[PDB]
Every structure is written in C-alpha cells, then in structure tokens.
Write an enzyme that holds these catalytic residues in place. Structure first.
Site, PDB file in Angstrom:
ATOM      1  N   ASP A 156     -23.255  23.167   1.353  1.00 25.18           N
ATOM      2  CA  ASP A 156     -24.564  22.455   1.545  1.00 25.18           C
ATOM      3  C   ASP A 156     -24.659  21.516   2.371  1.00 25.18           C
ATOM      4  O   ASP A 156     -25.346  21.341   3.270  1.00 25.18           O
ATOM      5  CB  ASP A 156     -25.236  22.228   0.035  1.00 25.18           C
ATOM      6  CG  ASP A 156     -24.463  21.386  -0.770  1.00 25.18           C
ATOM      7  OD1 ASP A 156     -23.512  21.165  -0.528  1.00 25.18           O
ATOM      8  OD2 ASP A 156     -24.905  21.208  -1.833  1.00 25.18           O
ATOM      9  N   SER A 163     -27.873  16.457   4.369  1.00 24.45           N
ATOM     10  CA  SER A 163     -27.003  16.535   2.960  1.00 24.45           C
ATOM     11  C   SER A 163     -28.274  16.884   2.106  1.00 24.45           C
ATOM     12  O   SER A 163     -29.290  16.213   1.865  1.00 24.45           O
ATOM     13  CB  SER A 163     -26.554  15.162   2.823  1.00 24.45           C
ATOM     14  OG  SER A 163     -25.886  15.257   1.548  1.00 24.45           O
ATOM     15  N   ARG A 164     -28.051  17.949   1.336  1.00 21.72           N
ATOM     16  CA  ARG A 164     -29.300  18.704   0.457  1.00 21.72           C
ATOM     17  C   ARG A 164     -29.146  17.832  -0.796  1.00 21.72           C
ATOM     18  O   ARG A 164     -30.176  17.865  -1.535  1.00 21.72           O
ATOM     19  CB  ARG A 164     -28.916  19.803   0.012  1.00 21.72           C
ATOM     20  CG  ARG A 164     -29.125  20.855   1.052  1.00 21.72           C
ATOM     21  CD  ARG A 164     -28.248  21.217   2.020  1.00 21.72           C
ATOM     22  NE  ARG A 164     -28.484  22.336   3.172  1.00 21.72           N
ATOM     23  CZ  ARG A 164     -28.195  23.591   2.656  1.00 21.72           C
ATOM     24  NH1 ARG A 164     -27.867  23.886   1.522  1.00 21.72           N
ATOM     25  NH2 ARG A 164     -28.656  24.438   3.724  1.00 21.72           N
ATOM     26  N   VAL A 165     -28.208  16.777  -1.139  1.00 22.63           N
ATOM     27  CA  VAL A 165     -28.321  16.251  -2.433  1.00 22.63           C
ATOM     28  C   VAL A 165     -29.032  14.933  -2.002  1.00 22.63           C
ATOM     29  O   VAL A 165     -29.641  14.251  -2.982  1.00 22.63           O
ATOM     30  CB  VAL A 165     -26.890  15.958  -2.907  1.00 22.63           C
ATOM     31  CG1 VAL A 165     -26.212  17.284  -3.131  1.00 22.63           C
ATOM     32  CG2 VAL A 165     -25.930  15.317  -2.107  1.00 22.63           C
TER      33      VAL A 165
END
Ligand SMILES: Nc1ncnc2c1ncn2[C@@H]1O[C@H](COP(=O)(O)OP(=O)(O)O)[C@@H](O)[C@H]1O
Ligand SMILES: [Mg+2]
Lengths: 503, 264, 50, 69, 51, 48, 261
Positions: free
Chosen positions: A340, A365-367
């Site tokens: 991800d 960055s998906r978080v």
C-alpha cells in the site's frame, strides 16, 4: 587446540540411520531431476552427498526437481540425495544481531559462528485479520520528505520504487541511520531491530554498506542478510523469506522490527531463472504466473500485532527498480498491487537538484496522518495540499498563463517548500527538528527570502535550535503535540532568526 | 600487459569463455603476486550474447527478450570474480555493448547493477558533435560523495548536472517554440549549459587521426577550475564555438582570442 | 574547564564599527562553527580496559 | 567407535609436534608476510611497544583590533 | 542612544573571551580523543595479529 | 504582426517535423510491442 | 453485514473462488430469504490474476496480454450469477483494480462489458488534488435517461460533461499561449468549468483523517440545484478555492465568506 579437538569429536554424533534417498538424473544448471524420493514432501530441504543443500520443488511422478543451494560442479549423475526430514529453516536469535548472515543461516563475515537458539520454518503462514491490528506507531525515517509527505507506520509495508541510480538504497540507509537515537534511548517501543536483505547485489556494495553502518554505529538494530550475485538463484530466491522469518521472530516476541528488501526485482528474476530451468510454462516477460503470489506472501508477512499478541510490529519496505521509468512492467505492477505505501522517485528531479529525489504525486501512503506524530500532523497537511496546488498551477502556467498575486504566491510557497525538502545524504534528523523547520517554512517567514538561500537557512537554523533550544525540542518531542506556548515561541524564534538571517 | 583474444570470428563456446581466461590471468596477478592490476575487458555483451547463442542451442527455455534464464547468475559469477580484494587490487575497465541502444535490455540492465562507475557513451551527443558522446546524467560513479571527493568537486559536478537537466527541459520548450520564449534566467541557463556541454568534450591522444587537435591531458584541478568558472558565469561573452575540443580553460580563452583575432 | 557567557547577538550587531564589520562577521560565523564543534563532542570516552 | 578415535590419535600426533607450526613450507611464511604486510598498511610504521601520544600543536587565533568605535 | 551603546560595551570582548576558552577546551579534548585513538589502534592491531 | 506570423510559421514547421519523428518512433515501438507479445505467446505455447 | 474475506497472500484457488463464496452468500440472501441485499466485492482483479496464475500452471496456452484464454467465459459466469432476479433484488458494488491505469487491459475491458453503471477513479485529478480522482468523462450509466431520472438532472449532467470535455481542448489551447487570447466567453467557460471541476470534490466522512475536514452528506436535489446554479451564471465571481471541499452550495457560500471576510 584441545577445545577444538573435543568439540570436533563430541559434536558430530556419527549416528548412522537408515534413510530415504534416490539417485540423480539430469543435473542441468542447478536443477536436478531426482528419481526415487517417493515420500519427499513438497518444498523440502534435501541434501546432496557432497555436503550441499537443495530444495525439492516440482514434485512430479517421474522425479523431483531439487534446485541446488550453490555450485553445480560438485554434483554428478548417480549420487545419493538424502532427505533432511524437514522444511527449509532459518536459525533466528537476538544474538544474530549485527552480523552479516548468508541467506540460510550461515554467517559469512568472519566473526565466529551464530549463537542461535530459535530455529524457524521459513515458509510460514502470515497472520490473519484477528491477530493483526492497524498502524499506530509513527515509523520515522529522518528524511524530511518521507516523514512529512509519505510517513511510515510501525505496522506497514511501503515501497521504494524508482529507476536505477536514484537514491533508493540511500533512502533505506537514511531510514536505518535515523533509528539509532531510538535504540539507545529508554522506551522499548521506540527500539529498532531491522533486517537488510540485500538480494542479488555485489559483495563490495554490501561490504561498503556494512562499512557505512559500522561507522555510523548501526550494528544493534541491523541484521544484514546478503544473497549476492555469485550466490545461487535459490539463495537469492529464499533470502527475503529468511529476513521475513527473522522479522517474524522479533514481531511475535513483541519487539518493533523492520525489513528492507533491497533489490526485490532480483528475487523476481532469480525465481524466473528457477521456473524456466524447472520447465514451468512462462507467463509475461517470461516471468511465470505466481510471482505475485511470491511477493504477496513475502509482503503480507507484516502488520501490527494485537495487544494480546505481544504488540510487536513489522515494517516491510521493499526497494524496486523499474527500467526507463516503466511502471507498467510486470514486477512493478505486481509489487505496487500488493503493497500500500509506495515512495516514487522519478530521476529527473535527482539531476534537477532535490535530494532525496522523491518525485512525488505518484507516491502515496494509505495510512496517512495516522502514522505521524501529532505535531507533524498539525503542521504538514496544508503543506501537502499546497504542493498539490503548486504542481498543478506550475504545470499549466509553464509559460505564464495568468499571473495574479495568488499564482505568484503559489509558485513562491511551492518553490520554497521544494528547497525545504532537499536533504543531504546519510544525515537523518529527528522529528522535532523537522516540525521546527517545516513550521519555519509553511507558517510564513520564508515566503519572500530568495530561494537559493534556503540551504544556508537550513544550516544556520539547525545550528541555532541545537545551540540553545534543546529543552524546548525535548518539550516538543515528549509532549507530543506542539503546544500553543511552544507555537508562539516557535513563531518568536523564527522571527528572531529571520532578523539574524537578515543580519 | 598480458593479452587474451577471443575475437568475434570465434564460435559461441569460445567467446563465452574469454572473460574467464583473461580474468583468471589477472586473478593470478592479484592473488599470488600482490600487484595492483588493471583489467581492460572489452566488450562484455559479447560474453553474454555467446551465452545466449549456446543456450538457444542448449535446449533451455528462452527468457525475456531472447536471452537465457541464467543471465543474472552466469554474469553474476563472472562479475563477482572481478573484484578488488585484501590480497591485491583490480581496477577493471570493461566495455559493455548495448544492443540497438536499449538500456532496458537485460544484459546492460544487470551490468548497471554489477558496477561501481558507469559512463553512458551515448550517440545522440555525437550527432550533436561532442566526442566521446558520454551521456553524463545517466553516467554516475559510486565514489562521488562530499566525504570523499571534497566539497568543491561535488558542488561543481552537481551544478553542471543541474544546468544540463534544466537545459533538457528547456530544449523541449526550445524545440517546439524557439529561444525567443525564454526569460533572462532561462536564457542564461541555456547559454551556460551549451558552454558546459561543449567544454565537456576534449580531444584524445588516440583519436588524433579523426580530429585535428593533439592529445590533451587535463589535470583534475583545472577541470574543477574551468567548470567552476563556467558555472559561476564569468564567461558570458565567449562564444560556444570556443569551448569545443579544447581541454584546459586557458585553451578556451585562447581559442576565443584567436577566433576574434582571425576575425580581425 | 569552560567559562561561558552567552549574549543575545543583537547588541553584537549594534556594537560593531563599519571598519571591522567583515571581520566581525568572520569571528561570529567562526564562533558559531566552534560552538557547534563543541556541541558535537562528548566529554570523554571511557578508560581502556585491561 | 571406529574412525573418530583414530582421528583423536592423529590430533594427538599433530598436537605433540610442537616447536613451530607443523611441516609448513616457505609459502606458509610468504602468506604470513603478505597478510602482515597488509596489516602494516592498515596503521603505518609505528612500534609494537611504547606508543607515542601526539605532536603538540598550538591553536593561534589572531587578535581582532579596531581603530575607533 | 549613544549612551545606550556605551553601556553595552562588555559584550564583544566577552565574545572574544569565550571564543578563546572554547577553542582551547576543544583542543585539549582533541588531545584526549587523539591519544585514546592511537592506544586503541595499538591494542586492536595486536588483537588482529593474534587472530 | 509580421514577426508573429513568421514565428508561428516556423513553429508550425518545427512541430510538424517533430510529429513526423515521433510518428516514426511510435510505429517502431508499436511493432516492437507486437513482436514482444507474440514471442511471449509462442514461447508459452511451445514450452507447454 | 456478512463478511467473506480471502487474503491477498493465498494460493490462487483461494483467491479466485472467494469472490464466488461472496456470491453464494449474497445469493442465499436474495434467493430464498426474500430481501433486498447488496454485495460489495472489492477488488475483482485478483480473480483474473489468480486465473492467470493457475492457467500458467495448469497447462493452458497464454492468451492476449498473458491472462487465461477462459477470461471472458469465467468472469462471465461469475458476473452473470450476480444480478437481480425476479425472486429478489441484489445490488453489487465492485471495486475493480486496473494495472497502472491501463483501461485497455482485457480484463477491465470485459469487466466494463459486464457492468451497469461504472465510475472511473483516475489519478490525474488527484495530481490536481480532487479526491477521489473521479473521471465522469469516462464513467457510464444505464440509469441516466430523461425518463428514468428526469430532464432537469439529465440536462445539468450533460451540461457539466459538455463543459468539462470542452475544457480539455480549450486547456490545450491555453497550454501554448496562456489566458491572453481565448475570448471573453472562452475564458469565461474555462473558469466556469474549472469551478465546476473543483466543485466535484466532496469530503468523505470516512476520510476525515486524510484531509482533516469533517465531511458532509449531500442529497440529490441539492446537487442538481448546485450544478444548475453554477451553470446558470450565479457564481462567476467567487474564486475556485471556495468550491473546493464543500457539500451543498451553502457550504461554498460560507467558505467564500470565510476567505473574503
Ligand atoms: N540525500 C541525498 N543527497 C545527496 N545525494 C544522494 C542523496 N540520496 C541519494 N543520493 C545519491 O544516490 C546515489 C546512490 O543511489 P542508490 O541508492 O545506490 O541507488 P541504487 O541502489 O538504485 O543504485 C549516490 O551516488 C548518492 O550521491
Ligand atoms: Mg540498491
């Protein structure tokens, strides 16, 4: 001498036992069709009589394709192949720290044998949806660009994708060199045990890498695992699974660990060699089908563990090179699809002047803000939105489409933050100095200050803040959030330093 | 110097084993004599290509573009034996053909992976007339580090690469529109860039038959001083024709003065 | 064994002549570099064990 | 216990052959000399006893002066 | 205002004083680190020769 | 207006030349993609 | 909600057939439960990847780009099992990966052939900054007809698509010379279309951590009135950033008042 005598004559049991074998057919190019092993289990470590392991894959009714762990001259046609009796395994301990370990367990660096205790199967199943919990800890890299636009989570996988010779291994070693200040500190939650799996590289690059880490005093987080070019294709294949198994040992004990998979495309091409020699059908770019399943196992061995399962995390960051920036190739599409987080370097910014050369909007960055500190979240979201605005307005106003005060404001703040995100090689800084300098860049005070002068502003500003503002940075990093008195104090100190900068 | 020749008239089995021959000669001179050897291997794509020809005959399944599956590890063993060790030093200059100017071909790609100093002797810069046509952007070296080569050399080198990258973007804009769309900053970058790009070229000693100039041996400090002056912009009056096939920067000043005097 | 007296560096700018302004810049930047060089060094390594 | 006790016996026979490294030949000492020569390269030309301390330098910062303030 | 600049005339000379004091203390600490380095070199060389 | 007409004439000519060059490299890239995909399919059906 | 979850690191028989498990559960909630049921299949491209991996290993000749020959047939079976019938009503939202923004990959093309109302989620409008970077200029609808939805909704939708499609060629006219020579009306429709494209962004309630904004809910009639009011010429004077991350048109009014005074 005498201790060597007694360990030689007591250590080897010489306990002979009846054992399953089978003679060898064609020993082609590291592959060996072995006739006879009618009770061998699939993907098993097996042993050629000259003292060398191989891994049994491709169980067929004729014969078993054992692919050798090393040289091919030492094997003839017609010799025995003894079953070891178990799946290929990696010896893991915390006494394995700071020691270069050849891909199985064999520490080839000239510092004695490994004092391992906990053998571990290397092809293990990754944890499910219940043993995992989400990213919580801010995995900091010391890079301003990474920690301010694409921050990492302790609990996460995040690519370093680029083209060749861009700074990807250098970003990985900035990430390594940052975490010394968290190891030698107090909290166990901050401390770092990292595993640098160098796949398919050359031995002198790994040697100079160990030189940089020893000179930077990195050898207590670090575990360097070298499967270099002269090593066989299954040693290059099996090496990142070994580093993953060592990271899983630290994770399931409850210590925050990470793995840098340097040159993961070399694992892909070594497994292409293995499949095409074991006569599997080729798929796309002659890579077989299950290369995605390969990297998918390897990269979903990592996320934050549950609070009842120790609380240890794993951070997988694999480094992957494209060719001519072609993201649409088979291995980059597969490895972008499994991960991800991904950090994109385009290279034209490396020759244009920003270092590290994240060319950016492709990187995500998906978080997101969940993996930042509270101060960096309070400061650097408007920076990302402003950089998006700056990129699109410069892209259509390359020639001077329309220049009001707003467009020159956007280009001014965009160029100044572009020279904020420049950073030298092998110099990672802590989170509090990053909050201070992006506060000095985003919250005014730098917008009309001659963009060639940003680097000397960086140097004198860090010298100022490390000179007489250490306890205030302690307040910032230990309090979490940047408080309102600290906010107006940073405003006053950046104003005073703007005076001392126009002094 | 010892010589090994497995030239292109040879069948593919022979050409797949010449680098091994000259390399074990130079590996003797490293190990059991302790000397600081040079190893000039031209042209390692012939090794890899002879491997591909043999493997097409060996009945192995073809890999990507048309090579063998053992391109990474055969060249891996052959390149890992070419290494400087504790017992002695090898400085190995090796010429590596690229097929049809593809750097994405598997053999040049893995050879970019196995090296410490690349130099992309391109062709398009020879269409522009610069010899050698070393693409300097795609050429790097592992040793360029301010804790090694000093701060002055590093700043001059990265400034030269910055000016040439800005010139590549601006030559896209120039090739469409023209140079009458650029500002003063952009035109000073373009002018300094063409001056630098001509000043990278020098005449060699061996290629004195093609050009007219004699062999120029430029020392290091004169390279730093010349490119530092051109980068700092003290030569905003010399023509770009005065930096072509020059060598030291005093030869560039003298060529501009002799050009003005022959126009006088 | 250091005796240090830090000033706010504003009166350092208010105090200098035009004659020695460049030398005051040199002494200021050299003092900044030398304070940073002090800050980079810890006090002593431990004694060599025997 | 057939073979390894014979190997034990030969460990005794190589152990009893003291008074220098056994049956070495000249290339033994040649490899010793090359390894020792690289080890001479990794420090310089110092001594194995009575270490020197330093060469006493002197930091000399020039006195700043002014005509008049 | 010139009276105020008269009052502040004990800052520049203090900057020279602590500059000299810091330079000399850094030089003595470099003496200490240096002799530590060379005796470290001697003992590590003997250990590597024995190894 | 005279010099602008001249500049746009020359820019149309340079753009047409670069369209011609990029169409040639588009065609050779197209043929290389077709031959690559064809060799992959034929290699798969032959190694089957 | 009933969850069927096959991880991304399972062998391809477990990563192809898990979509069929979700289909079977949601068929039972539609066949003989007698209930309106909705099924969220994220992400049917692992299905085609799994099929291509086994077809590499099963002994089948590779097709076009490298997938199985049975792509269209296998996905035809598992996408025609999932449709509403006369017994029950089932609505299926499918998150469908494309590799590196390549819509001419055959598995997304055949997936287009199976849908009813797609939605392209481009990246380029997020390089702009609009999230999600939705392409409606490549999106479809079976539902969008003047008798189904209305004439007002249909005409404002085709007006938005007409002014965004014209903005592309007009923007390529801009890209050489600039905002100087377009026209009065040409610069007006460029700014109007850019204002609409900024108004397409909407803060999600689940994404209040990526941008920080709280996120709102917009009914249908409010969207029709807002886009008809931007096309109607009411808001030619407000800046483009006043419409960026808003809900209704009242939120754009409030943000314009916040930026101005
Ligand atoms: N922050 C930085 N500042 C200066 N140079 C950098 C920086 N980051 C990377 N580099 C450059 O990148 C090069 C190393 O690239 P590397 O990470 O080895 O790429 P690869 O592993 O693909 O070869 C070095 O030559 C170094 O000069
Ligand atoms: Mg690398």
């Amino acid at each position: 001498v005498s201790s060597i005598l007694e360990e030689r004559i007591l250590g080897a049991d010489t306990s002979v036992d009846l054992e399953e074998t089978g003679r060898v057919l064609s020993i082609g190019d590291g592959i060996a069709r072995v006739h006879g092993l009618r009770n061998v289990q699939a993907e098993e470590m097996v042993e050629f009589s000259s003292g060398l392991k191989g891994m049994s894959l491709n169980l067929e009714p004729d014969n078993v394709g054992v692919v050798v762990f090393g040289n091919d001259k030492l094997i003839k046609e017609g010799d025995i192949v003894k079953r070891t009796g178990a799946i290929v395994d990696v010896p893991v301990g915390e006494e394995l720290l700071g020691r270069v370990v050849d891909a199985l367990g064999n520490a080839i660096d000239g510092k004695g044998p490994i004092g391992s205790k906990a053998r571990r199967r290397v092809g293990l199943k990754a944890p499910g949806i219940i043993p995992r919990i989400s990213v919580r800890e801010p995995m900091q890299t010391g890079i301003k660009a990474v920690d301010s636009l694409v921050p990492i989570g302790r609990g996460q996988r995040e690519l370093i994708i680029g083209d060749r010779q861009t700074g990807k291994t250098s970003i990985a070693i900035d990430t390594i060199i940052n975490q010394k200040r968290f190891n030698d500190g107090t909290d166990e939650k901050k401390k770092l045990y990292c595993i640098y799996v160098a796949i398919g590289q050359k031995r002198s690059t790994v040697a100079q890498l160990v030189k940089r880490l020893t000179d930077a005093d990195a050898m207590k987080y670090t575990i360097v695992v070298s499967a270099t070019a002269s090593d066989a294709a299954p040693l290059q294949y099996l090496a990142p699974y070994s580093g993953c198994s060592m990271g899983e040992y630290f994770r399931d004990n409850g210590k925050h660990a990470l793995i840098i998979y340097d040159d993961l495309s070399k694992q892909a091409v070594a497994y292409r060699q293995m499949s095409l020699l074991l006569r599997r059908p080729p798929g796309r770019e002659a890579y077989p089908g299950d290369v995605f399943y390969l990297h998918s196992r390897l990269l979903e061995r990592a996320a934050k563990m549950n609070d009842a399962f120790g609380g240890g995390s794993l951070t997988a960051l694999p480094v992957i090179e494209t060719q001519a920036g072609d993201v649409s190739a088979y291995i980059p599409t597969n490895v972008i699809s499994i991960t991800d987080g991904q950090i994109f370097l385009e290279t034209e910014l490396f020759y244009k002047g920003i270092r590290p050369a994240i060319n950016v909007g492709l990187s995500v960055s998906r978080v997101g803000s969940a993996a930042q500190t509270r101060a960096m979240k309070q400061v650097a979201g408007t920076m990302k939105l402003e950089l998006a605005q700056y990129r699109e307005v410069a892209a259509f106003a390359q020639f001077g489409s329309d220049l009001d005060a707003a467009t020159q404001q956007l280009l001014s703040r965009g160029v100044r933050l572009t020279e904020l995100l420049k950073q030298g090689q092998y110099s990672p800084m802590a989170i509090e100095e990053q909050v201070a300098v992006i506060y000095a860049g985003v919250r005014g005070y730098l917008d009309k200050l001659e963009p060639s002068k940003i680097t000397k502003f960086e140097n004198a500003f860090l010298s100022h803040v490390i000179s007489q503002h250490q306890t205030l940075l302690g307040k910032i990093r230990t309090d979490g959030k940047i408080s309102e008195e600290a906010d107006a104090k940073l405003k006053e100190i950046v104003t005073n330093f703007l005076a001392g900068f126009e002094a | 110097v010892a010589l090994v020749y497995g030239q292109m008239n040879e069948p593919p089995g022979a050409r797949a084993r010449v680098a091994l021959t000259g390399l074990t000669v130079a590996e003797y001179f490293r190990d059991q004599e302790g000397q600081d050897v040079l190893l000039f291997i031209d042209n390692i794509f012939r090794f890899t290509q002879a491997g591909s020809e043999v493997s097409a005959l060996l009945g192995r399944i073809p890999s990507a573009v048309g090579y063998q599956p053992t391109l990474a590890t055969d060249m891996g063993t052959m390149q890992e034996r070419i290494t400087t060790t504790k017992k002695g030093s090898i400085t190995s200059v090796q010429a590596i053909y690229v097929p049809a100017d593809d750097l994405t071909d598997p053999a040049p790609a893995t050879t970019f992976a196995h090296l410490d100093a690349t130099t992309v002797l391109s062709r398009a810069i020879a269409e522009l007339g610069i010899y050698p046509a070393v693409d300097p952007l795609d050429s790097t070296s592992r040793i360029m580090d301010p804790n090694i080569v000093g701060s002055e050399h590093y700043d001059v080198a990265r400034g030269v690469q910055k000016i040439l990258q800005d010139y590549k973007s601006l030559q896209d804009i120039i090739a469409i529109l023209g140079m009458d769309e650029l500002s003063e900053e952009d035109k000073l970058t373009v002018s300094r860039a063409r001056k630098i790009q001509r000043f990278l070229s020098q005449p060699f000693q061996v290629a004195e038959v093609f050009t007219g100039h004699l062999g120029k041996l430029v020392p290091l400090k004169e390279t730093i001083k010349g490119f530092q002056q051109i980068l700092a912009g003290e030569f905003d009056h010399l023509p770009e024709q005065a930096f072509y096939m020059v060598g030291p920067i005093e030869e560039a000043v003298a060529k501009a003065d002799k050009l003005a005097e022959e126009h006088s | 064994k250091l005796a240090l007296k830090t000033i706010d560096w504003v009166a350092f700018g208010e105090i200098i002549p035009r004659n020695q302004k460049a030398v005051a810049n040199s002494l200021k930047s050299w003092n900044e570099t030398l304070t940073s060089r002090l800050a980079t060094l810890p006090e002593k390594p431990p004694a060599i064990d025997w | 216990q057939k073979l390894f006790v014979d190997k034990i016996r030969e460990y005794r026979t190589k152990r009893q052959t003291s008074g220098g490294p056994v049956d070495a030949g000249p290339e033994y000492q040649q490899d010793l000399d090359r390894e020792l020569f690289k080890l001479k390269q990794m420090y310089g030309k110092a001594d194995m006893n009575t270490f020197p301390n330093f060469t006493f330098e002197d930091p000399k910062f020039e006195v700043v002066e002014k005509p008049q303030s | 205002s010139q009276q105020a600049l008269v009052q502040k005339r004990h800052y520049l000379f203090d900057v020279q004083r602590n500059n000299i004091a810091m330079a000399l203390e850094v030089t003595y600490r470099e003496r200490l680190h240096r002799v530590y380095r060379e005796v470290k070199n001697r003992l590590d060389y003997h250990i590597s020769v024995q190894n | 207006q005279s010099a602008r007409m001249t500049a746009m004439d020359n820019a149309s000519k340079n753009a047409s030349e670069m369209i011609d060059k990029l169409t040639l490299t588009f065609n050779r890239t197209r043929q290389a993609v077709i031959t690559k995909e064809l060799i992959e399919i034929i290699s798969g059906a032959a190694a089957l």
